[PDB]
């Protein structure tokens, strides 16, 4: 019973202590519904934390660390109970234990604490977790331990309110440059995910990632055999190309677009959608980057997904098409016209997602505005496929912006 366990764990006889701590650990690690609240209420947390101090009994440290790991794997309130009982400085102490298993379990427990959120993370960082954590990365580290270390690095990179301190990013990035060459799938997926959490953190973090020289090693992972690596890489480099034209161009200079045929045709619709999101962030750049997309023979695939894809991919393809018109030259838009973009583009005008309707109308407006002489021909194409009837109907749309733009388009181009 919990009462007896707590009593025996407070004991000064460490054989009885160990048996009781192991019984608590068993309650916490037998299934996926451990009674964390009951064990917290019983008052065991201070006892487990005290057990963490027993350098003379590594078994007790390990078992207590395991129990605390599992308590900390629960809700924010339960993780915080672990933090409130002063567990963190003692885990940091155990990071320098001579016994590997004590060290590993302390790393795991800290991973759960760090994962709870940015304020916990920043407490742990302020006490100096990063350098000891990274110090375990060496040729002899067991692969299971290294997987835990890399997951902890994910947790150090991922929260955004606020993001991790710049110093911490500067310490972590060289380790990620080391780990991106590992062939263990788990380590590689977690490495690329940590990178993606850095590249989603802002232009300055993106530039830190670029300056580290790692992007040339990241881009080829878009064609890794493991789809989990492929999608993690798609996220990391996609976040990069959400930034400036120059950062996007760093990505394009690693032959990124070469990897996309196998992603636009992937059987998984979610992958098509994510690839088309990436490409829409490319077509929103300057004329050279639009041309990069064109020269890679990707537009017909984008237009096919716009026509026949699932609605999420269709939405992302509508974005890619419309974004092309921001800085695209008349000849680039003309290429799109040649590729039968208008019928499926216009077919998207009757969907329920007002954002898609707006995107399509903005694109059509820019296309017509750009075409000086061909405006009449493009209008004839829009009418041919039923697009004009759809715009006319949109004049009665609920959304202010949509019906205003429908009026604008009709008046400026279909009122001769």
């Amino acid at each position: 019973s919990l009462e007896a366990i707590v009593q025996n764990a407070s004991s000064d006889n460490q054989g009885i202590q160990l048996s009781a701590v192991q019984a608590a650990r068993k309650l916490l690690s037998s299934d996926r519904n451990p009674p964390i609240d009951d064990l917290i209420k019983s008052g065991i947390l201070p006892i487990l934390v005290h057990c963490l101090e027993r350098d003379d009994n590594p078994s007790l440290q390990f078992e207590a660390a395991w129990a605390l790991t599992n308590i900390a794997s629960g809700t924010s309130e339960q993780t915080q109970a672990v933090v409130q009982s002063n567990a963190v400085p003692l885990f940091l102490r155990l990071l320098h234990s001579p016994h590997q298993n004590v060290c590993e379990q302390a790393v795991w427990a800290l991973g759960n604490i760090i994962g709870d959120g940015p304020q916990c993370r920043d407490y742990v960082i302020s006490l100096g977790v990063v350098k000891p954590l990274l110090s375990f990365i060496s040729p002899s580290i067991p692969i299971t331990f290294l997987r835990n270390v890399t997951w902890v690095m994910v947790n150090l990179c991922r929260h955004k309110d606020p993001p991790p301190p710049m110093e911490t990013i500067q310490e972590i990035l060289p380790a990620l440059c080391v780990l991106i060459h590992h062939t263990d799938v788990n380590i590689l997926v977690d490495t690329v995910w940590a990178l993606s959490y850095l590249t989603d953190a802002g232009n300055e973090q993106i530039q830190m990632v670029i300056d580290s020289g790692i992007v040339p090693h990241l881009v080829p992972l878009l064609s890794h055999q493991e789809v989990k690596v492929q999608t993690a890489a798609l996220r990391a480099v996609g976040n990069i190309v959400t930034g400036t034209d120059e950062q996007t161009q760093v990505v394009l200079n690693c032959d990124a677009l070469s990897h996309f045929p196998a992603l636009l045709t992937h059987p998984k619709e979610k992958i098509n959608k994510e690839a088309v999101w990436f490409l829409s962030n490319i077509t929103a750049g300057n004329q050279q980057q639009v041309q990069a997309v064109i020269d890679a023979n990707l537009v017909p695939m984008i237009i096919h997904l716009l026509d026949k894809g699932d609605f999420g991919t269709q939405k992302e393809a509508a974005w890619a098409i419309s974004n092309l018109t921001i800085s695209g030259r008349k000849d680039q838009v003309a290429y799109l016209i040649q590729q039968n973009v208008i019928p499926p583009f216009c077919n998207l005008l009757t969907v329920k997602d007002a954002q898609v309707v707006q995107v399509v109308l903005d694109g059509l407006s820019n296309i017509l505005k750009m075409a000086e002489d061909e405006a009449e021909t493009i209008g004839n194409l829009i009418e041919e496929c039923g697009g004009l009837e759809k715009i006319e109907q949109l004049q009665n749309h609920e959304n202010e912006d949509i019906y205003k733009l429908a009026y604008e388009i009709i008046d400026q181009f279909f009122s001769s």
Partner: peptide, 26 residues
């Protein structure tokens, strides 16, 4: 409005867990 966009909801839903329990026999 047209332009670049950040990761959209529902994309990359298979993120690494924030927390992991150590389960005996798993």
């Amino acid at each position: 409005c047209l332009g670049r966009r950040v990761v959209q909801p529902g994309m990359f839903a298979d993120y690494p867990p924030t927390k992991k329990a150590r389960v005996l026999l798993r």
